[PDB]
Amino acid sequence: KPLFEVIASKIKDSINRDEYKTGMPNETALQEIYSSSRTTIRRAVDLLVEEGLVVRKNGVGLYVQPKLTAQNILEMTGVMLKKDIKDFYIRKAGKFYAEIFGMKENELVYSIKFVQKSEHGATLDRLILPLGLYPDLQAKDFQIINIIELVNSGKYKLFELEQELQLILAGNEQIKNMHLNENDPVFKLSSVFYAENDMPIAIQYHYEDAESTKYVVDFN
Amino acid sequence: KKPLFEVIASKIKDSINRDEYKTGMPNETALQEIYSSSRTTIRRAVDLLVEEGLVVRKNGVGLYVQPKLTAQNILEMTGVMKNLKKDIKDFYIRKAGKFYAEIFGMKENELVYSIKFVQKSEHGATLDRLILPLGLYPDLQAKDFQIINIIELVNSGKYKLFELEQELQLILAGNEQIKNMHLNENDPVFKLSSVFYAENDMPIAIQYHYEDAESTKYVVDFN
């Protein structure tokens, strides 16, 4: 078995025992820790990335991916009616979020997706929080009971909220998570949270079934 | 001549005009003393002021001066002199009534500020209505009701903002939307309702925001 695979397994263990914390040693440090080559480390880390265990901060270092253990789920939501977490992971901002946040598209953001049983059907929420703006949070700190509190828990204080409201056709996200049919009408409430001086610090998308006995929505 | 209650109402009006009394005054008993007049005379003077929309009673409690949208206050509240800015249509004190009393968990006869403003946007004018209970924003004068940043304003009273609860609806345009947003009757409108809470499940403010829901991508057929 190749060395890089051996080292990747060794690092997986370190991650399993919370030795490396989301919120780890860079690749140069890993060379020294494992007395191995740059190439060996790069290939070991490539494998861990592919498995979704860690993520690189281009030209900076390495982050461990958050894990939705029963314990972290308990910390974040209070459970085990309520809020069910579907996804929590770190990803590059990409171009779309880079323009909104005014950051580099290869810089990292947290992406959180959760569903909630409500009045008329399940609702779906997506939260995007730039890693550089919420530096000190560990997975258990990402409590989703109160979104205002969460958005306020990072490096900057929440100052202002800017919101957009739309009617859209149910997409794959909605049909799957909200139990809707192709093209059913859905309210999309988009929120951009700002710190002072026009600095966006978080984005949120909230979706609800728009069906009603009062009207019919007809999309072209 | 001019009856005494009217003479006294004029003097109170004068005091109001010179900001001796203002939003954020002596109660009716103190007025009896100040003007050396009867309970009945003072009650009639105040009735006159209330009718003129210059003051409002707090059930027994006392007397509040109604805020004034003078040029100065408007400048203070919105930063605007004399679009894409905020234009105040209404600012006054009123009883909560059943509907708001139930939301705030307060007494129907207790007072709230009602603020209405309009804003030019991409898909036309939007309309906002804010409700802030007096007892939760006791120390604010007229010029303190800055509406540049609603979160800042909601956070500026007795309690700190802790949580936000929102409701999303499609409604038919009513008179408010007709006049203020230049829509036709039964035009579809987005209504975004916000309830702002302090810690421990205590509502401190309500906001209703309205936007034209017309789109080139769908039509809304109301029943």
Domain count, chain A: 2
From B76, B102, B124, give the residue that closes a domain: B76
Quick check: A212 and B168 CB within 8 A? no
Nearest CA in chain B to A161: B151
Q: Answer yes or no: do B95 and B72 share one domain.
A: no
CA distance A177 to A180: 8
A124 with A157, same domain?
yes
Q: Which residues of B213-222 are buried (b: 16+ CB within 10 A; e: fewer)?
A: bebeebebee
Instruction: Determine whether the interchain pair B221/A215 forms a contact, defined as Cβ–Cβ distance below 8 Å.
Output: yes
Which experiment gave this structure? Answer: X-ray
The position carrying tokens 């309500």 is B206
Beta strands in chain A (DSSP E): 54-57, 61-64, 83-92, 108-118, 121-130, 160-169, 185-195, 199-209, 215-219
A 147-166 → B contacts, CB under 8 A: 147-149, 158-161, 163, 165
* Interchain contact, A215 vs B188, CB within 8 Å: yes
Residues B47 and B90 both lie in one domain: no
Resolution (A): 2.1
Task: Say yes or no: B96 and B154 in one domain.
Answer: yes
Are A88 and A196 members of one domain? yes
Among A149, A165, A208, select the one facing B211 at the smallest CB separation.
Answer: A165
Q: How far apart are CA B74 and CA B170, in angstroms?
A: 31
Residues A98 and A173 both lie in one domain: yes
Residue B75: half-sphere exposure toward Cβ, Cα within 13 Å: 5
- CATH number for the domain spanning A161: value is 3.40.1410.10
Same-domain check for residues A137 and A190: yes
Distance from CA of A127 to the nearest CA of B (A): 16
**Number of alpha carbons in the 13 Å side-chain half-sphere of residue B88:** 28
Residues A101 and A53 in one domain: no
DSSP string, B95-159: E-HHHHHHHHT--TTSEEEEEEEEEEETTEEEEEEEEEEGGGSTT--GGG---S-HHHHHTTSSS
The last residue of a domain, from among B55, B76, B97: B76
- Say yes or no: A107 and A62 in one domain: no
CB proximity list for A62: less than 8 A, separation 6 or greater: A24, A25, A26, A27, A45, A54, A55, A56
A187–B168 CB contact, under 8 Å: yes
Question: Both A68 and A82 in a single domain?
Answer: no
As given in the structure block, the two tokens for residue A12 are 């997986």
Which one of B59, B76, B93 terminates a domain?
A: B76
Residue of A nearest to B169 (CA): A210
DSSP conformational letter for A128: E
Which residues, other chains included, contact A28 with Cβ-Cβ below 8 Å and sequence gap of 6+?
A: none
Same domain, B70 and B86: no
> How many beta-carbon contacts under 8 Å exist across A and B?
64
Which of B127, B146, B151, B210 to mutate against chain A (most A CBs within 10 Å)? Answer: B151
Distance in angstroms (rounded) separating the CA atoms of residues B207 and A157: 22
Q: Which of residues 189-218 of B touch A (CB under 8 A)?
A: 190, 192, 211, 213, 215, 217-218
Q: Chain B residues with CB inside 8 Å of A214's CB?
A: 170, 222-223
A160 contact residues in B (CB cutoff 8 A)? 149, 151-152
Please state, as a whole number, how many other Cβ atoms lie within 10 Å of the Cβ of residue A59: 6
State which residues form the domain around B156.
78-223
Q: Are B69 and B91 in contact (CB under 8 A)?
A: yes
- Which residues of chain A have a CB within 8 Å of the CB of B188? 215
CATH of the domain at A35: 1.10.10.10
Query: Do B57 and B83 fall into the same domain?
Result: no
3-state secondary structure of A180: coil
Cβ <8 Å between B218 and A185: yes
Which member of A159, A165, A218 has the closest CB to residue B190? A165
Say whether B220 and A215 touch across the interface (CB within 8 A): yes
Q: Determine how many CB atoms are found less than 10 A away from the CB of residue A109.
A: 25
